[PDB]
């Protein structure tokens, strides 16, 4: 029916016009007066060795000390970052994991990958071993990202162009967040854990309401597939990273691309993005073997975290914002501070 | 220096390190293969000769070599998002059905897929064990239907040997990296010797890699 197509066209036009109407000025113009942060020299405090394959994901614990790491050797290594002690080494049923999550409480760890199953491992067992607490099956594509709402419910994103809110106890999809045209690659929980943003391969980041279970806003602007996404600390903005070698800060309330972070010397894709505690620094992991720390308000390349011998796959910032942990394909986890 | 608990935790970490080491040494000897076919290209036949969702693991030992074959059928999404997962695969067992040239076109799609995989930036130093399955059916199909229906400007006889040789040559094209060596082999239904040619190809790839590391290639 052409009436629906033309009506959707006029709708898109109305959305674009509404977005443009409220865009009176740019963040770059407003932030020209503020003093620019001086260059930051973060040193490699620790190097976590032990993985024997490409590290694909990591997730800091809420105590900012423990961190879990997932690689292609079928191992979930939970490290003690302070002492570089391997706290746990969980052997994976499928050695094809692309994500790993640490529960806020610090009791469970979730991972998954090309097996299309979100394996949840209980750490606080009376037997003193880590056993598979739950096997969340149902996604028809590879599991790209997973984040715990709490110990009972977990949101995951899959390569079948779908996010799913699961209830761990029952092991069924409580909610199904559909709408992305391309494979959903990243997730980012809002601080209040009410809404979440998901960046897919259709060059669009979609905001979903966890309770209602349906999309709220859609943000476009990237010229390629989005790989990473991360909320701003306050929970009103979020930054994305794509294969077009650009970071994009969008604002939820303004509902439009707020600012871009691109350099003419950078051409490789982006794999991970994270904010500092205050949100002033935007740390992005690139495929040029090093991480770049940008000024979130000036788009000035504050620093370059170099040292990894392969593509930077994942990075995370602690809850207290003390150090940043970068996991790369060279099978190394470097902690920078 | 360290307290009793810190020392016991360090000992635990050392035991974990030792286990990770042993597991790595045990797993490093495995020959990892990627069965990358195209639908009804003869993946089920070749895997049945060698031996709900997600990739399929086929592990088999043959003459002191443990081959771990990975079949990626359930992944209907875009390839590139998980091709990097199999970056260090020893070889790609690419299966193509010779019969599927006139009927659908199927053959053009197989050539396009082969082009995409062979020229992928992750598969640069990766050899392809090309299998031309269902040769029996092509035996009579070429005698009934000419090969020109699929490949314009063939300009050759529609016989048995030369038609397959041409198809093989057209598949050996679209190969740029000199390091890549396509071990084209024509199979038919079930022969119970495709494991032997797989072993011979794998050992040739291993030798090539060793000589490349030493600096002789």
């Amino acid at each position: 029916l052409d009436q629906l197509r033309q009506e959707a066209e006029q709708l898109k036009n109305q959305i674009r016009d509404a977005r443009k109407a409220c865009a009176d000025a740019t963040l770059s113009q407003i932030t020209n007066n503020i003093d620019p942060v001086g260059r930051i020299q973060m040193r490699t405090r620790r190097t976590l060795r032990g993985h024997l394959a490409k590290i694909y994901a990591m997730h800091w614990g809420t105590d900012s000390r423990l961190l879990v790491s997932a690689s292609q050797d079928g191992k979930l290594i939970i490290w003690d970052s302070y002492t570089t002690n391997k706290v746990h080494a969980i052997p994976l049923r499928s050695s094809w994991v692309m994500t790993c999550a640490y529960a806020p409480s610090g009791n469970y760890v979730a991972c998954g990958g090309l097996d299309n199953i979100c394996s949840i491992y209980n750490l606080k067992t009376r037997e003193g071993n880590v056993r598979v607490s739950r096997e969340l099956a149902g996604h028809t594509g590879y599991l790209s990202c997973c984040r715990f709402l709490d110990d009972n419910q977990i949101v995951t994103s899959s390569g079948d162009t779908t996010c799913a809110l699961w209830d761990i106890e029952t092991g069924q999809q409580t909610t199904t967040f559909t709408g992305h045209t391309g494979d959903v690659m990243s997730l980012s929980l809002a601080p209040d854990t009410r809404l979440f943003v998901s960046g897919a391969c259709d060059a669009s980041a979609k905001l979903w309401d966890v309770r209602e279970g349906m999309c709220r806003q859609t943000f476009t602007g990237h010229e390629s597939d989005i790989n990473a996404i991360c909320f701003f600390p306050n929970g009103n903005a979020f930054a994305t990273g794509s294969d077009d070698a650009t970071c994009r800060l969008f604002d939820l309330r303004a509902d439009q691309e707020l600012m871009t972070y691109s350099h003419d010397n950078i051409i490789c894709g982006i794999t991970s993005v994270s904010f500092s505690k205050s949100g002033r620094l935007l740390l992005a992991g690139y495929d040029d073997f090093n991480c770049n720390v940008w000024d979130a308000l000036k788009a000035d390349r504050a620093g370059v975290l170099a040292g990894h011998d392969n593509r930077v796959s994942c990075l995370g910032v602690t809850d207290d914002g003390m150090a940043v942990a970068t996991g790369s394909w060279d099978s190394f986890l470097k902690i920078w501070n | 220096t360290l307290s009793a608990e810190e020392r016991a935790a360090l000992e635990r970490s050392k035991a974990i390190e030792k286990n990770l080491k042993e597991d790595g040494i045990s797993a490093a000897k495995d020959v990892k293969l990627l069965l990358l076919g195209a639908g009804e290209s003869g993946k089920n036949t070749i895997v049945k000769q060698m031996k709900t969702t997600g990739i399929v693991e086929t592990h088999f030992t043959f003459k002191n070599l443990h081959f771990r074959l990975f079949d990626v059928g359930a992944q209907r999404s875009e390839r590139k998002k998980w091709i990097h997962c199999f970056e260090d695969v020893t070889a790609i067992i690419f299966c193509v059905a010779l019969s599927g040239y006139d009927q659908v076109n199927r053959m053009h799609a197989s050539l396009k897929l082969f082009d995409s995989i062979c020229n992928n930036k992750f598969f640069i130093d990766t050899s392809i064990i090309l299998f031309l399955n269902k040769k029996d059916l092509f035996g009579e199909k070429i005698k009934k239907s000419p090969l020109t229906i699929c490949f314009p400007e063939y300009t050759g006889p529609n016989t048995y040997e030369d038609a397959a040789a041409y198809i093989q040559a057209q598949f050996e094209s679209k190969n740029r990296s000199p390091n890549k060596e396509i071990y084209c082999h024509m199979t038919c239904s079930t022969d119970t010797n495709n494991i032997q040619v797989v072993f011979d190809a794998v050992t040739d790839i291993i030798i090539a890699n060793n000589l490349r590391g030493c600096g002789l290639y």
Partner: single-chain antibody
Amino acid sequence: VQLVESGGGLVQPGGSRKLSCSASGFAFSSFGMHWVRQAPEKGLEWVAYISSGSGTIYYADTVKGRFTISRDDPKNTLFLQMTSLRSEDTAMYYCVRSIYYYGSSPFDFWGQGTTLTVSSDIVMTQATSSVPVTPGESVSISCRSSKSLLHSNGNTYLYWFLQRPGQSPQLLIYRMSNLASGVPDRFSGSGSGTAFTLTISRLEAEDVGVYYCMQHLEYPLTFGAGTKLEL
């Protein structure tokens, strides 16, 4: 999870005895095992420890040479071969599991114990002994250490244990703060380096028993005298 130990009996002073504790219901291979004895009508006294993998073995100064501890992972068993005995070696020998990693709760589970009879360090003190309480009000048990337990890393290695009358000691608190799994929130441990306090907000019928304060800063592990709370 259970530890069933056997071997306890009447032994001549010069005789040898082989205590065998069979563990079942948990990953025995990955737990550090302690032989801790309680003399008749006396407090706890740590005897020996063997780490996960039999890598590290410690003995008390009073049993060095005479006693030997050995582990059998295949069959999940702990052995205590005591060669030479004395009149002071009669005790109730408990097998205590203790896994050691960051955030772990060592000494969480205790075995039933075997009553065997026969024919410098951190001086842990309490100076409390008997405390006569009626159920309902708060109770404050004070433990004092000869040496400051606050390690530079930033935690104190104090362990509150509850031994109910005629039962195996149970872990109440570890690192003087963290309550053990299954312990109600009434128990609250506090302290500073030397002086430590265990507070029970509301005492019930089941709280009657002996309260031991153990140090875990460095071997040998020394228990307190034991504060007995009763009606």
